[PDB]
Structure formats: structure tokens, C-alpha cells
Amino acid sequence: SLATDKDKLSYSIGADLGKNFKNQGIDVNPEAMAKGMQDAMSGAQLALTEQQMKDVLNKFQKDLMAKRTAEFNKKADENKVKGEAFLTENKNKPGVVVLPSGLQYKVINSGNGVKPGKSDTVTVEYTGRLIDGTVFDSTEKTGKPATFQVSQVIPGWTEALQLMPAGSTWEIYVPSGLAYGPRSVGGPIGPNETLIFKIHLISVKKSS
Amino acid sequence: SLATDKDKLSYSIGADLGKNFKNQGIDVNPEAMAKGMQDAMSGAQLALTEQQMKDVLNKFQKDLMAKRTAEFNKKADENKVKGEAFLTENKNKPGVVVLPSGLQYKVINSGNGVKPGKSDTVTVEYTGRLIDGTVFDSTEKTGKPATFQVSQVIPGWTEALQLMPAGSTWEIYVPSGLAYGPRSVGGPIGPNETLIFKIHLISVKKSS
Ligand SMILES: O=C1[C@@H]2CCC[C@H]([C@@H](CO)CN1Cc1ccccn1)N2S(=O)(=O)c1cc(Cl)cc(Cl)c1
Ligand SMILES: O=C1[C@@H]2CCC[C@H]([C@@H](CO)CN1Cc1ccccn1)N2S(=O)(=O)c1cc(Cl)cc(Cl)c1
Ligand SMILES: [Zn+2]
Ligand SMILES: [Zn+2]
Ligand SMILES: [Zn+2]
Ligand SMILES: [Zn+2]
User: Which CATH number belongs to the domain containing residue B177 in this structure?
Assistant: First the structure.
């Protein structure tokens, strides 16, 4: 029973830690953990030498990073394989064009304005989704267009924008190499993920 | 008893956590913590609601930062008071000169070369110590001199260098305002700490 907040806090700390252990593969014994925490807090002689524990925890970290490196490689290869399957089927579909870099696109509506240069600025309404349809960014959520310097977005966009007349709307299919490649820092887009964009290029502006 | 490495690891995790709790004021009950970790790992219904725990842990963090903010303010004011006492006694000592910025210095040996400018580069052999004599940096450990642009060191050094002829050796006493002020990121130098330097200015070089 948890009468006091010392208990409520301790329990809450334990549950948060157990939750992080549970979904990380770390198989730990809560009773042996309580004993070592108690020995540390009481100032008693710990059951392991400073050195034994150091080896214990360093092996722990070594094994942990390896487990997390294998999972990342495993997902990186699954996405890569998924993306290739997708593009292989997509190249066959009507109106799809494949470029040397592997970028694919399909003209929805062809505009009549100018093609932007690698130093230009552009205004676009866009929507981006994973292969499974999961949308991860859209200007339609902002309710207004966005502006980018063509040379300052992912390679897939840079190669696409340079081919679109202003006023056009294209769907582009971006192999991970032209996108975020082996990403391991941002949640929305996993690693080696192929991306699908609807891009409406509104306006092009040069610079000085 | 800790027969297996599951136990050795768990115990070592517990001791490391208890050690970090012990010297942080966090009074926790290891048995109530083991219960909540076990409930999390087993998938059982936790004894507190998701919300109860959230309040528990957020109050915890609030109280923690405050305790750590009060300790820092307390040490910041102790160092500041120590440093002022030191400089008040030091201004009276033979050969000590006090400048408008509060910097104090004492000529050990006067050189005959040029005074460096605020854009110059200099070569110096130096030693820096806290008020209590604790040395925290020295070129005599490197065994060779160091180079700095006068405008790119702590203000105390910038105001001192501009007054020293090359070849001179001075002791300078730097109020924390001319040093690192309320530092809270680096261990060697605490906050609001007054610093004592022996500085030998070897050579001055201009720039283009
Ligand atoms: O080049 C891009 C691409 C292409 C269109 C513009 C957006 C912005 C975010 O609004 C991210 N960039 C710019 C960029 C991102 C990373 C490094 C360098 N440049 N993205 S994005 O793919 O829609 C995107 C949007 C968001 Cl919110 C997160 C991520 Cl990880 C990716
Ligand atoms: O202005 C300084 C002063 C003055 C002499 C040169 C050294 C260097 C480190 O070798 C640090 N600097 C430069 C500096 C430090 C911080 C921000 C901007 N400039 N220090 S120092 O005071 O000896 C010093 C040395 C070391 Cl190792 C750590 C600290 Cl926190 C401070
Ligand atoms: Zn957005
Ligand atoms: Zn190209
Ligand atoms: Zn050094
Ligand atoms: Zn000045």
C-alpha cells in the first residue's frame, strides 16, 4: 500500500523505470535492484566490488548499443526493401517518369511559368506521405504556402523543382538516398524510407 | 545472494541509482520502487492512475530543480562573498594595484617590449588558481607556451594584457565579473569564483 507521497513517488519512479526497461528488452530482477539501491543509500558495503560493478555496467552498455544497432540495421533494411518494391511497381504505372538519379514523378497539371534554378527561391503547397499513406507534413495544415531555396531541401526536391514550370502540380516518389537516408534522430521519418510528395510550385524568385 | 548476472546486473543498476539518489537528497523507499517496477514489467494494473503518477513525477521535477537552484544560489553567494573578502585584503598588500574594473595586479618582473593591442595575438606561460590555491590550468603542465588573441579570453586577461610590456611577469587577481561569473556548466571553476593568475607575456604579434 502507498499511503505517503514518499511511497507514491518511489512507486511512480519504479513504474517509469520498469516501463522503460520493459520495452527495451532489459530483463531485470526488481528485488535484487531494491537490495542494491538500499545498500547504496544506507552506506553499507555493496555486495560487489567497485570493479565488478564497473564491468557489469560496461558489459551492459556494450550489449545494449549492439542490440539497438541490430534493430536499427534490421529496420533500415526493411524500409529499403519496401521502398525498392514500391518504386519497381511504380515505374510501370501510367504517366510515371524515372530519372537517372532514381527519382520518379508524375505530372498532375503542367504549368506555363519558368523552371526554378539551383539558387532560386520557391513557394509551394505540398503534402508528404510515407509509402503506407502516413502523412508527415503538409502546408494544408498551415493553411498557407511555404517558401524554400531550391538548394536547401532534400535532393529529391532539388532535382524535381528544377524541372517543374511554375504553376505545375506533380507527384514525386523519392528514394531514400534522395531524402533522409539512414535517419536515426527524427521520429516522423524512419531510416531508409522512400517518400511520396504532392508538390504544387506556385512562384519562383531569383536572388542578388 | 547474487548468483546470476541478471542479479549482478540488477543489483549494480540499483546501487548506481541509489548512489545518485543518496547524494541528491531524494528520499525514496526501495521496496515501493521495486513494486512499481514489477507492476510495469508484468503488465499489471499500476496502483496509481496515469494521471496521478504524472502529477507525482512533475511535482518531483519541480521540487528537484528548485532544490538545485537554491544550492547553486547558495554557493554562488558564498564564492562571491569569499572573493570580495580576498580582494579587500589584497588591495592593501605591497605592490598591489587596483584598476577601475576591479582587476588587481602586482608586477613581478617588468619587461621592456610592447604592450599588446585588443586585436593582437600573444604567447604566454601561465598558471591559474582558485583563492584556496587549487590550480586549475597551467602551461607548465604542457611544457610549452600558449597562444591567445587578447580579445578572445576572459575580460580580466584582456584588461591585463593590454597593460603588460612583452617580457613581463605579473600576478593578477580577477573578480568573477571579469572571469566566468555565475558559471554552472564546468566543474573546475565554480560560480562567482575570483581567480588568481601568474602570467608571463612572452611575445606579441599583430594581424592583417
Ligand atoms: O527538404 C526538406 C523536406 C522537403 C520539403 C520541406 C520539408 C522541411 C520541413 O518543413 C524539411 N526539409 C528541409 C531540410 C530538412 C532537413 C535538412 C535540410 N533541409 N521537408 S519534409 O520532407 O516535408 C519534412 C518535414 C518535417 Cl516536419 C520533418 C521531416 Cl523529417 C521532413
Ligand atoms: O580566457 C580563458 C582563460 C584565461 C587563460 C586561457 C584559459 C583558456 C583555456 O585554455 C580559457 N579561456 C578562453 C575562453 C574560455 C571560455 C570562453 C572564452 N574564452 N582560461 S583559464 O581561465 O585558464 C581556464 C582553463 C581551463 Cl582548462 C578551464 C577554464 Cl573554465 C578556464
Ligand atoms: Zn508543417
Ligand atoms: Zn542531378
Ligand atoms: Zn591546460
Ligand atoms: Zn576596460
Answer: 3.10.50.40
Which of A8, A22, A33 lies nearest to residue B40, judging by beta carbons? A22
The DSSP line for chain B is ---SHHHHHHHHHHHHHHHHHHTTT----HHHHHHHHHHHHHTPPPSS-HHHHHHHHHHHHHHHHHHHHHHHHHHHHHHHHHHHHHHHHHTTSTTEEE-TTS-EEEEEE---SPPPPTT-EEEEEEEEEETTS-EEEEHHHHTS-EEEEGGGS-HHHHHHHTTPPTT-EEEEEE-GGGTT-S--S-SSS-TT--EEEEEEEEEEE---
Q: How far is the CA of A154 from the centre of ligand 1 (A)?
A: 7
Q: Is residue B170 within 8 Å of residue B125, measured between CB atoms?
A: no
Tell me which chain A residues have a C-beta less than 8 angstroms from the C-beta of B45.
Answer: none
Asked if residue B87 is part of any domain, the answer here is yes
Domain CATH for A30? 1.10.287.460
Deposited experimental method: X-ray
B132 interfaces chain A, CB cutoff of 8 Å: no
- Which of A32, A5, A37, A30 minimizes the C-alpha distance to A15? A30
- Answer whether A56 sits within 8 Å of B5, measured CB to CB: yes
Q: Whose CA is nearest to atom 9 of ligand 2?
A: B137
Chain A: nearest CA to B26, how far in angstroms? 9
Inside any domain, residue A47:
yes
User: What is the count of structural domains for chain B?
Assistant: 1
Q: Which of B2, B7, B11 is the mutation pick for testing A, counting most A CBs within 10 A?
A: B11
Range(s) of the domain holding residue A115: 99-205
3-state class (DSSP) for residue A3: coil
> Same domain, yes or no, for A55 and A131?
no
Whether residue A156 lies inside any domain: the answer is yes
Query: Does residue A84 belong to any structural domain of this protein?
Result: no
- Overall resolution, Å: 2.4
Instruction: Indicate the residue among A48, A78, A108 that finishes a domain.
Output: A78
B10–A30 CB contact, under 8 Å: yes
Query: Are A114 and A55 within one domain?
Result: no
